[PDB]
Symmetry: D2
Subunit: 499 residues, 4 copies
Amino acid sequence: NRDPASDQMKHWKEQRAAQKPDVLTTGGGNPVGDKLNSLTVGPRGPLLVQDVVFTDEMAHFDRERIPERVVHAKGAGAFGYFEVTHDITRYSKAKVFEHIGKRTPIAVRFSTVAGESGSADTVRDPRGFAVKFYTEDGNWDLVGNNTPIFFIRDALLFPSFIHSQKRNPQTHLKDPDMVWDFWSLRPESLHQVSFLFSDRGIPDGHRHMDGYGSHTFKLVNADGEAVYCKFHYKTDQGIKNLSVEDAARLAHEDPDYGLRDLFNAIATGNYPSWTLYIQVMTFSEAEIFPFNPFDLTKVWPHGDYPLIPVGKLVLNRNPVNYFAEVEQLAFDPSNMPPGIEPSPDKMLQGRLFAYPDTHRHRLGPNYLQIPVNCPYRARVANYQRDGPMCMMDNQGGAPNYYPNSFSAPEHQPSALEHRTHFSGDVQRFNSANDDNVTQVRTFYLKVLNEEQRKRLCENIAGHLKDAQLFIQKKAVKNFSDVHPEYGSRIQALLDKYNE
Amino acid sequence: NRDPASDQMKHWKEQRAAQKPDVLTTGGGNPVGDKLNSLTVGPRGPLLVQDVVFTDEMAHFDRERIPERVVHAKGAGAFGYFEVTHDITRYSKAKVFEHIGKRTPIAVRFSTVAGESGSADTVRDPRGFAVKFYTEDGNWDLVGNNTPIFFIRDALLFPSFIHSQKRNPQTHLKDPDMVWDFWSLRPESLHQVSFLFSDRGIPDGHRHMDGYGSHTFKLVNADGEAVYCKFHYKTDQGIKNLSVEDAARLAHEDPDYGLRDLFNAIATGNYPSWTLYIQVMTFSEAEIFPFNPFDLTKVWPHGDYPLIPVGKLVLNRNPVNYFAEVEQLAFDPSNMPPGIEPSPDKMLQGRLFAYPDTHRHRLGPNYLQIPVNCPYRARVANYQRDGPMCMMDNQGGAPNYYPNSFSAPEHQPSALEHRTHFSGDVQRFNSANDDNVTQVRTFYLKVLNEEQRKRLCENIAGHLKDAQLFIQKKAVKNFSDVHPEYGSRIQALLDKYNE
Amino acid sequence: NRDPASDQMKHWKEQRAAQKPDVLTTGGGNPVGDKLNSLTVGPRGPLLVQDVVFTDEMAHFDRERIPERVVHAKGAGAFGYFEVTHDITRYSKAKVFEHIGKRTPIAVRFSTVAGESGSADTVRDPRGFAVKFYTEDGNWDLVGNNTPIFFIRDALLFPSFIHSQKRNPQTHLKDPDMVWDFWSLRPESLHQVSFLFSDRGIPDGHRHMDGYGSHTFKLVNADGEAVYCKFHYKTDQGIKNLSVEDAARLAHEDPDYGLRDLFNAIATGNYPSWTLYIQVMTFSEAEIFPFNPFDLTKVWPHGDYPLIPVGKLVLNRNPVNYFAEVEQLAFDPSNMPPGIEPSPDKMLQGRLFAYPDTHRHRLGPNYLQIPVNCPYRARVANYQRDGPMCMMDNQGGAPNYYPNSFSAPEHQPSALEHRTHFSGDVQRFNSANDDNVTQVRTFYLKVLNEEQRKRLCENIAGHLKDAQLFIQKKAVKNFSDVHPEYGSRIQALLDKYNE
Amino acid sequence: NRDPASDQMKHWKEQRAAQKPDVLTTGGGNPVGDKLNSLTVGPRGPLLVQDVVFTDEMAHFDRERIPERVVHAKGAGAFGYFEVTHDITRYSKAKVFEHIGKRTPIAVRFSTVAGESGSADTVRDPRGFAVKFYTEDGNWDLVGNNTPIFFIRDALLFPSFIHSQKRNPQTHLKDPDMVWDFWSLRPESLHQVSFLFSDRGIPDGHRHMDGYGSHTFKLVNADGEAVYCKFHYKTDQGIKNLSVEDAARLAHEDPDYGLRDLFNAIATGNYPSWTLYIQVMTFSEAEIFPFNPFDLTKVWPHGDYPLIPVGKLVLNRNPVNYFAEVEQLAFDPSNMPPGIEPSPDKMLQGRLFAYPDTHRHRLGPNYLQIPVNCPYRARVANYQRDGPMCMMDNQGGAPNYYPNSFSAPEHQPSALEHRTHFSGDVQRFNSANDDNVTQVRTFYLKVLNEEQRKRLCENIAGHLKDAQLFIQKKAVKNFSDVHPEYGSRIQALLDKYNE
Ligand code: HEM
């Protein structure tokens, strides 16, 4: 006996009963006589164009690959649902939070960042935990991460950052000089480099990690009052990382550890779950926060702004076809239904654009027409038409201009954005010096126990050692600024590695 | 009031009736509060990225167009059915002919040839008569023209021919020199040229012409008995052609004439139709025919090859959305169910490749998944997977390799290519002089009478006159070779023209 | 000897006198033996997949077409230069206006608006007049039209407007109901529609029409002193239009009359040219302007804001390959170099996005590298990399992240946007009631004379007659709001048309 | 200091020094003022669409990716030349072999097979060794592997084979059930499989393995005489393999072993090199020859058919930009200059279309225009035009149809292919019978020392051990079909692994 995972074709064969096999048809659905032998003139004669069976299937074969995700290319996903267990409708009128017991189906995808399609799960990298909510008011995409913060606070540097986190332009090899020259030049990353290199840097499976909407969002009650929030979905299976030693081990043993684990979990009736919380911040409060409540490289102290439960997140139906249901998955941060809105978070703002952007290029213009991405729990009706690979009925003969005197789709004013005032010059305001240590300090000596406080200091030096010298100093100079003992312990390890 | 075509919107609304307007949603199903004004800071302030309602709409509009067909770009389509009136089973096994009274859903697209998207319907040009049968053995595409022949017999010149017939590479204008140099350099074009400048060069609408398969085909009955044939779908609305003066009027008065005539013909229950006949030929009498039976520039004499009736072609349904149903329609000559096979027709052999090849580019790798293209009357099952914009289940979780031992789609010895023997050197045999006059001569003298010959000559002359002298004399010669007088007449009008 | 355009292939010959024909090769440079005959087994044998030559060509022929422009699909282009003849440096620091007697290469494309690629040139429709300036600070695209205003003033209506301007989704025909239902419901269009149906609605080719920026832009000088402006480039060939009667003739006679006219003019050394002026308005006057200064449906009286000579545009060179240098041509209003900026014009704003966006689809991610679109007069150095069909060296092995301590490109502080203050609530402000008749009323009464008013209403009435009765009522009512006489005239004609 | 690959940026900044850094600009060439801070209204305000600096960069980043090769995604590349050392003149007229000492530029890409973009270098899997010769008669693409045979013999089985070597349709993990089920059912693989698990199954870098043309080819001399040859190029740095435990750790130690290895070799002046040899066999000999001389699972023995030397392949140049030069590199087997022609090898013939076909997909219609793919040591002249992303001048104003009377490119009768008379029926002949054991035996005993045999058997077991029992059964059957002790040794190793 084998595991569910490896027993895939197994179960399929049985579940196919004793019903004869279907017929191998061409793409056009024409019956195929023999597809195991080309069409030739003579036993040793040349290939005839006439073998269209060959062309038909070969042709398709030549185009199965589509561009992989720019970032977060490696991962897996499953389906399940969300169910309300609290009433926060006093905070947001989002139909998804209707009443208690309210269930909305979902799709989830876990993933790393820097690695490519061939990469392995078991490595030190942040993680992607995206949630798609098929609500009655369209789809809501909570494209979150296993962290409440990020390395940078302005989108304009994200590409550059990701660049530094991947291969060298010429060599095509990972490069420390790149990694650390960047981080070192931008301390705002401190807070996050601290989490990545902490024990959390490498979880164990996707099931033993927490989620974070990260950014500061906006909730609008069915009364127009708005308030800021933060999304958190802590694991119920409890945290659980992996020994550096084991990581690199599993790495080459089963580079897809995360996949099968998460997969067998569901196959073996052991469905993973997370608990949804949110922190609330009135506009009054925000005006008070000692920091930028919108800074992505900052958190909200749990004590000052406590979490409120709202619901359960359950995954219990593994995909039936990986390509179709997971690869093709598209999550658009901009996909926020009535009740939730973005904040002036200079990083969340940019994400409003880029995601649907790339999706147009990675998948295609009508990518929202792909099953997995189709908002089937709603009714898409508008004035958009055509485009490549246009399935559906393209909305039939319905009037295609608005406004029209022919009863075509009208807009519901009730779903209007929330009104806020703004005053100030249009400029490129500097966010580089918006405190990149304080919050980090209270992490080192407070959240981290002397036990793991040192571990982190090891993980870093072991990677920082590979960078040039001038680089290593700046880095230390930064850690030092968080805490002298920080850059002191590190500089130690480095000096030794240095012989 | 006015024609049904012009009453489209009026009707669509009256169908709405009691139903109320649908809510205006984004591509993501999110309702919009006001799709008529932008989100800006202040009434005279900047536009914000935050307006994802705009970007959602704008971004789609920007991606509405797909490449138009490289030829036959202008056209119109309709849906109807096929009806078996005669048992021809003793010739072919195609299940579409399975039994008299059998109806097979068909789709059809009419079109011109050279003109682009916005060209006029009423202009001299061959006419496209593509027919699609959704059978249980997959789809059969009978991509015919309104001519039984063509200007050339080697697919290798098709690109060149179309280039000569389209715009000048630098001025972008129509070029008579290009048109005539090519023609004058390839007399094998004379047959189809004659037919082209004849009263049939411009029919009155799409309902007033016949549909031909042109190429010789192959039919194999339930006993595996091979036979050659030709398809003919003669119009039941009678052959009506349009004068040169009126075609010129409509050219600007109504460039979409054919589209309108057709829509309305059906919108008023005036379903046009065509009787589908076919002629048969033996490999014996084939080796006996005085010409290459697969030469696209020739016809099988009626006297020797009487037409055999098969069934009817009724068009009784208009498209509901032109883009999804007509624009995206794709016909591949290679889609022939068991019972219909190609022939050594050089030209035919070429089309076996070109159609799906161009479809993979104009529409996309997965174009067969387009509703209008999907062979629904049949169920597709094979090992091809993925590819961009993959709808449906991607065959869910069935084995993607063949052979296998888990019960998945299989062969069909029943549907195997009819085997024919061939022999001979393998080279690029020259077909430039396989009689390019004989059948034209009989046309020009016995098929036409003095008034038609008169017109035919001015028609040719009125266009040729704009080509360079040397191309003129060049062209004359070819004509005289079909007949001294044929040439002399055109010559006459030429000098007058040169005046 | 005919007009130059007709003798293209003739001169190409002459051009390379003695020079001998080059060897015919495949796309791979492999020389071809015989491009006129297909390689088959025996003179009447099947086609061999081994005939790569054929397959090489056919595959290319099969993908020659790219999506046509979403709007302004039918056009013509040329190249020339822009010479500075007046000092306006006190207004803008743009290097293009840098000094008296300075010439900058420019590219231009003329066009219609709603017609597809096959469409005719001489049809009532605004006319695009896009100019690309290859300047030192990158390219500057002044994407004007032949009118200084437009039909709408908020980008959200554009897709809707265009849709109503094209073909019925189901019939694929032009629908006057669609056209007038829209216009009737959006009275802000009166001005344009009034200009459109006037005499200028159909110029005598491209050479006899003015060009305009339409929008208001902001000009910035060396001390950072800004001012709002308008760009006008008047034809030196003098205004000249076509009678509704001619155009209809030309429509079928020479659908490419504009293309042919412009080409030949240049080909014969009769270079056309426009004089570029600018209208200036300080930030103070804007505050007290009787209308919204960024309202595309309004003009700046010549009386209060005089025109100022800037320089001249001269077209002296025709394209060599239309597809290469014209069809691929791409203009982005976003291409504004230091010294030239946008205004809050809602319409202009949405444009900053849609052009590049649509270009990424029509042409491709790297369309800026196509020769005609490359800023060859400036040096592109940035942190952008990869993408399909990537040419040049991809910036070689240069550091691909910013910031970095390795001497890669750096931003220039002197090229910072002119800051401006804004303050207001963030929301969708309504711009419908913004006076839609004042300026129109002036045009009807003062700008036109009795002769003209007569034609205008004739032209309108001639088209409007086809719209449903209730729609005609609506629109007539709108014209009345402009002027009682205006409505009666049309109404009169209508009554007539209605027998 | 550290290796050359590590000091990449170091050297770049080194040679770049003594210069001022370039100004950062937009794709359009406009200098950016600050690329680190987005444009907003007020320090805590929203992001404006006005920020085209942002959209430009991000939009591009959103499009950096393109689909990876359907197979062989993971690979390294370099450039060098081919030096003729010997005269095989009396075999191929091919200019590349013209004289002794003749230099011809080349490009090479080494790669694994079933692994995706993120996969590791040092794994058991065949190795891809492709070489592109830029010759004056166009490019010659010798697409070889690090072995002279291959699992299958009919193209039709290939896509299916590949599916088994990749991930499961639903679970997405490497699956030995499909791997082995396929191989078991298909015993012709026996040869390669043995080689696959041999000591060579994992080379120590790309520098210590041999290249193989694999298929039988055809050479033609100045006097129309052709023969059937083979291509063998042996490493000069010697065949050095990697242990199963060595490669296993290298897996996570440094998954980019090949890359680093090859980059540094070339970087330090230690250019690798190979010697090209050609086996030969006359058409007569081909006849008398035992089994099928075009069977890809069979080989020619140096015994009866000796290895004739032709020249040297030296690599002395690294890529400057990996994406532009290696990723975009496309090799088409169908690219064969005069003197070299395909052979009846089904598998081969199938590759004749599959390669350019997928290139048009993965790279684009105009891929032969990407610098490194262009046949630059030749001169492209033909009648192909347009297509997306068209560089150059699209052949300028030259006539675009053939034949023509305006002195455009003419074909070369001298380049006509070799005419090989062919006869025989026409149908899908069986191939599963060609002795899948003879040659195989002369390996397990002759070309393989006892020691290797030991671990070889151990390898197959180490993998197969995870396959369904029934699978193993059949698996051994074939092995024993080779020779008893073979399957026996395995069969023993089996039951043990089953605890
Ligand atoms: C009929 C069977 C075969 C088919 C259908 C086939 C198909 C393909 C395809 C589609 C690719 C991807 C091309 C790209 O994306 O650039 C590829 C690449 C490759 N194939 Fe095959 N192949 C076959 C047999 C073989 C054989 C026999 C060899 C060796 C003689 C081989 C060597 C390679 C190599 C080395 C590459 C990588 C080239 C590169 O670096 O770009 N293939 N093959």
